[PDB]
Structure formats: C-alpha cells, structure tokens
C-alpha cells in the first residue's frame, strides 16, 4: 500500500549537494558498511531530519538516498494520518512500521511532520487528541520497546521549531541536517542538470543568469528552465542563447512586460523620479553598483525600477553601519526633493508617497534600534519626557536626510536632465551608458574613508603618542 | 468576465474534446467520491487525446487551511488527489488543464507551484473598446434601433463585465417589451442603465417640502461649485451630468458624475486635491449661504469625507512640507460607489496603502490636528466666499430642480451663463416663474 516501485534516483540526478552529500553517503555507509559500525560498539542512528526552505528537493533527496542505498523506499504523506476520527491513524502508523520492519532492509520517508508533530496542548479539540495519540504511537514505535535496528526514518520539515521535544530526544531524531538555499555553484549545477533534457548551445554562460536570480530556491531554478522551453516562437530563432535565459530571469523576477497608452508628461514624471533615484544612488557606496534603470511599466508596478547588488554577506550578519542607513533614507528621499526641485512645493505629486514612508519607517527604526547617539542608544525610558523626545530625533534625522538629498540633487542638475531625456527617449538604460553619462555630467563625490584607513591613521597616531610618552618619561628620567 | 466562455472558445478553436465540471460538484458528504470522480475525469481525458479539462470555481476545492464535520477531510483528500494527478502528467500527452477562479487569495499555494499551474492569466474587466465590442455582439442578437449609440454606453460604464452588459441588453429589451416598442430605443437603454445603477423609480413616495429642499440645496450646491471651479480656475475635476431628487433604490437624491480618464487618476497634484476638497465642502457651503446659520444633517456626510481627505493630504501623502513621522488609518471606511461623490481620484479615498504607524509622541498629533483644522476652515471659507458671490444662479438652479425634479449639467451651465456674477436677487425674484427654464435640449 505505502510502497513505491521504480526508484532510480541517485546522487547524480540531484544537484547542489555539497558536503551534505558526504553526510548522504554516510547514510549509504550506514546501509553498506554497517557491520563495521556495529563491531565498533556503535548504535545506528535511526533518525535523520532534513530541514530547509520549501522547493529544495527534500523528496528528491529522499529518493536519491533510497536509490543509492539499494533498499525498499516508503514515502507517505503525513496529512493522511490526521483524521476526523480517532484510532485509524495509530493503526496506520503501526501497520506502516510493521511492513517497513518485515521489508528490512528498507528506508522510509515521512514528509511535513508539522501536521502531526505539533506540541501537545496547543489546540483544544478532538483533532488535537487524535494528533496526540498518533504522535505517541509513532513515539513508541520509534524507540518505545526493543526490536528495531534495520529501519531508518527520513523526515522533511520546513519549520523545525514546531517539532516535539520528545521526538528530537536522542534515540528518536538525533541527526539534523539543514539543506539551505543554493548559493552560486548549486545554481549552476541545478540549471545544468535540469537543462540536460533540452537541446542547448555551447555559448551559454549561465554565470550571468545565476548572477541575476540571487537567493532563489531550486524549484525556482526549475521554473527558470521552464521559461526557457516555449517562448521562442514569437521570434523563431535557432538555439537557446544567453539573452533568452536573461529575459526569462527578468520575467520571473518582476513580471510580464506590457505596454499601454500614455501621455508625455507622465513619462517625464516617471523618468524624473527614476533619475532622482539613480542619481542619489550613484553618490553613495552602499548602492553604487547600478545595473539597470528603466521606466517601463510591469505587472503590479506602473513605476520604474533600479537594480543594485552589493555583497549579500553584511545584511545576513547584520553588520550595516549607521552611515549605511542614513544614506539609504537620503536615497528614499531622492524622489520628493526632486519634485520640490522641478515642479515647486505647491505642485507636489503623489508618486513618492511610498518611498517617503519607507524613509520615515527607516528613521524610526534607526532611532529605536540603538544606533542613535542621543544619550547612548537607549531606546527605552520610563518618564514621559524622554519617550516624547524619542520621536523628535526621528523627525530631525528625516529633515537632515531630506536636506542632504536636496543638496545632492541640486548638485547634479545637468546629469538629471541628460539621464531624464535618455529615459524618456529609450525607456530602458543599462549600466554602461548610464555610468558613461554619470562620468560625463557628474560632480565631485568624495568617498568617506573606510574602516581600514581609519584604523591605520589611528594606529600610527597611537604609536607616535605612546613613543612621545616614552621620551617624555626617558629624557625626564635620564 | 467569461472565463468559462474563453475556455469554451479555446476548445472550439482547437477542435478537441472539452470536459467542463465545477469544483463544488467534487465536494460531497461521502469521503472518497470526489477523488474517484477526479481519477475518472482524468482517465476519460487521457482516453480522448488531445483534450481540454476545465474546472470551474476551483477555490471551493483548493481553499487554504486558514488559521484565522468530515467535509474538510474530504476536501483535503480530493485536493491531494488532484495534486497527484497533476504531478503525474507527462507533458507530451497533449492534455491541457484549466482552472477558473474568482478569489486567488483563497487558493492553496501548492497548486500555484510550478508543474501544476505553470501559467497564471488574469482576466481583467473589458476596456471601453472591449465593452463596445461586447455590446455589439449582444445587440446583434436583438432588434436594435439606429438611435442607440453603443460607444457612449461603453465609455460611460467602467468596470462592467460582459455578463453585466448582456443583462443590460436583456433588461432594455424587457423595457421595450413593457413599453410596447418594436425595437430597443435609446430611451430603453437609458432606462435599463438607470435600473441597474440607481434602481427603479417608486410610486409617489415623497416626504414633506422641508426635507426635500435641503437635499436639493446640497446637490445643487455641489454641482454649482463643481461647475464654477471648472469655469473659473480650469480645475481638472469631473462634470455633473444630471441631478435627480426622485427616490431611486435606497437613495433619496443623486448627482450623476462623468468619470474622467484613468491617466489623470494617478498624478493627483495639490491644486486638484484642494479643488476636490472645495467641491466636497460646497454642499455645506450652500447650506450656509442659503439657509443661514441653521444647517442640517444632509450636508454632514460630505463634511465627513473632506474631514478625512485633508488628513490624507497631511499624514499619508505628506504633501505639505513640515514633514510628519506617521500616518493614521481611517476610523470610518466607506466603499467607493455610484452617484455619491467620486472619492476614487487616487483609486480610492478610504484605503490607506499600508502607510500607517502607531504613534509615540502625542504633541505632533495635536499639531497635525491643528493644521488639518486650519486647512479645512480655510477651504470652507474659500468655498463659502465663492458660493456667496453667485447667489442668483444657485437659487435659480435650486428652484428649477425643485420644480422639474431633475436637471442636467448643460442646464446648470446655461443658468450660469444667463446669470453672471454679482447680479442682484430681485432680478430672479421678479420673474413670473422661477422654476421655469426656456432651454429645450
């Protein structure tokens, strides 16, 4: 009933494994070299749990490790265990573990334990009672009494925090393996292994494609492959090339490109907004690298957009400076000030009503996030005066950033005009031409010194003053 | 919008078998019948290849497990069977599956994953040209008079689906049958339009003269303020088509407003919003300049919207330039609708775009309240000063609308042309009949 036929997935059919594959072949060793494991006085760990984002191929990983193990494979949905009546689920898991026991050697797979692995006492109902009964039955089948060494369970959950502490107790679910989002090389391998089944060209550098689809799951890479199969009848070309995959990545990243009737002043307004955004984005190190700048309307966003990719390591670790945030608010204050510099204060539009709210939210978050230097951070107080004064600093930072944005914008009026003319004329601008116009019409942008230069100057100053103390002690003593 | 009609068109153009079935037909009392029906339908489609399967109202089966009987278990089992069947499809077998839905939010995201629903096509309501074509198609089936101009009704009915246009044509044919007309006249079209929009007219259900002159004063003042703002400062506002005070449906009075093009509904500038605020305050301005200091409740409703709109000027949009730190949600929410004032100039009036934050400092709140009161009082004073300079035209329009029970925008424009500013009231009061108009449209 719960048995499958025709399992042939191996480690070659799955891509982007890394050192996890090593752990995977450990399971193969657990299924092959087990006599040496047992002779060294070691109990076989029967519980492995794969945790990660959905779409990483948890079922594919289970199929691959089952095929490489060379044993019978069981894959069962956990939603079948939950029933409006109580009792059938415990019998189902008992019969499941029994047929797994008699089919030894074998490996079983149970996906989405979050339906049946919830805490006992979070919902008051008969369904919760059935869930508790099934959880206890699987608890007693896994470790409860002696008599199982050859059946190994495989678990695949997206939220490991809902797991019962009874299950993760040593002896039931001890091995925990995280399968993360693919980085760079995993995306190459997944795209290539999904693209073997389609005729493909030899000039196809997937590096740029994966450099566009940063931080996307393997199922999304399969989708990118899927938007590289049909759509070529409109032009009718010969072979799949780089630009087709680049456009497919652009489509799956933002949406379908649609053209509608429009006036000229609307295009001028949108291009002025995008021009302000890009011009202020140029003058800061936090978002200097600009790739695309367009004003074409898309699905869900009539307004234009800009693309920037600074290294994604500081955001994950949280090492962003205060100057990194105070600039960004200025960037989010780029559109409205441009309106004040182009149409007057009496004719402010309502297109920047979203970025201006982002600027004020970022200012409030920076104020109450400990980055403020009013007393020393201290985003919490007791008396009413200091709590009232907390919000005033957000307004002061907002006004300072708005004035800085206004000054920066007034510094670059010629670059403003040239890039806005190019935006209304071409509707899309790449990195090369935009940076060429920035070089032709830009002003001075003195970059503030980084951490290394400040460290070096402070180190030489410290050494010189400590050696000054050295002579002022020595020649005074000698 | 004819999603089922579109699927039937695809099946007819392809010349392939078409298996249409509703999702609610898969939901029964006995558990497992729906999964068996799913399997049988997929098997029958696989027998007659190529084929098109169509499931209407798939949200009945694919309802999300919301965290806000055995029917839920049966629905889950049928959805799992559908997922298994869709995942097991080989692409080269030539069977195309279509699922129609009205609420994409209720759908299970598992179905939205690649491999089950690869293409997601949004069937938007038809445009003016599309509504014109749909009206032509539906009027090809019924005897039509040459005086009916379908382009005007296509342009004047935004957001109308093809089914609604078909119902409009059928109701007009029914009206023509009731009026014993040999063909659908333009009057039948107008009657059907008014029946669908504002409802049918009642039979002599009228209140006293006191409670009617007030509604007349409000509607005529709003229309006069809008027309004057169009005439003098060339405001980018709407136009008053017609005003009625006959009860229709659940509304005792109405002002039909012609909807402008959508390209002017995005870049709402400060003068346009201030002029619309003046239009909203024009009703209470008319009550103040006509009925002195004894106003009524019939002008408070507009007084509500203006009292909210200025707030959206100062907090949500941040149009003035002392910058604010947080917005506020609307305490009262009113749906955009028919003959009541537009309040959809930026798509909607009572819909904050998730730009609200809870406050910490309470002094900025009273500063914002003071600024809003100042702006509201200034705009109210401005519209009262504008309306008080034209009293003969306003009173003449009030009397004409009170006599005829209906008036048109061109009649209001003619009243404004025949009554220049600063005319004395004795010119109107010396006429033989104030509620008479010598213009024949």
From Swiss-Prot, chain A:
Positions of ATP binding: 52-59
Keyword Nucleus among UniProt keywords: no
Biological process annotations from GO: protein import into chloroplast stroma; proteolysis
Subcellular location, record wording: Plastid, Chloroplast membrane
Topology with respect to the bilayer: Multi-pass membrane protein
Keyword NAD: no
Keyword line: ATP-binding, Chloroplast, Hydrolase, Membrane, Nucleotide-binding, Plastid, Protease, Transit peptide, Transmembrane, Transmembrane helix
GO CC entries: chloroplast; chloroplast envelope; chloroplast membrane; Ycf2/FtsHi complex
Disrupted gene: phenotype observed: Embryo defective.
Signal peptide bounds: none
A GO molecular-function annotation: metalloendopeptidase activity
Record text on subunit structure and interactions: Homooligomer. Interacts with FtsHi4.
Family classification: In the N-terminal section; belongs to the AAA ATPase family. In the C-terminal section; belongs to the peptidase M41 family.
Role summary: Required for plastid development during embryogenesis. Might be involved in chaperone functions or play a structural role in the thylakoid FtsH complex.
Stated name of the protein: Probable inactive ATP-dependent zinc metalloprotease FTSHI 2, chloroplastic
Gene: FTSHI2
Residue window of the full protein shown: 399 to 876 of 876
UniProtKB/Swiss-Prot annotation, chain B:
Name of the gene this protein is made from: FTSHI1
Oligomeric form and interacting partners: Oligomer.
Location in or out of the cell: Plastid, Chloroplast inner membrane
Role played: Functions in chloroplast biogenesis and chloroplast division. Required for plastid development during embryogenesis. Might be involved in chaperone functions or play a structural role in the thylakoid FtsH complex.
Knockout mutant characteristics: Embryo defective.
Family that this chain belongs to: In the N-terminal section; belongs to the AAA ATPase family.
Protein name: Probable inactive ATP-dependent zinc metalloprotease FTSHI 1, chloroplastic
Species whose genome carries this gene: Arabidopsis thaliana (Mouse-ear cress)
Result when mutating residue 51 to P: In arcl/ftsHi1-1; Pale seedlings. Smaller and more numerous chloroplasts with abnormal thylakoid morphology
Residues of the full protein shown: 474 to 923 of 946
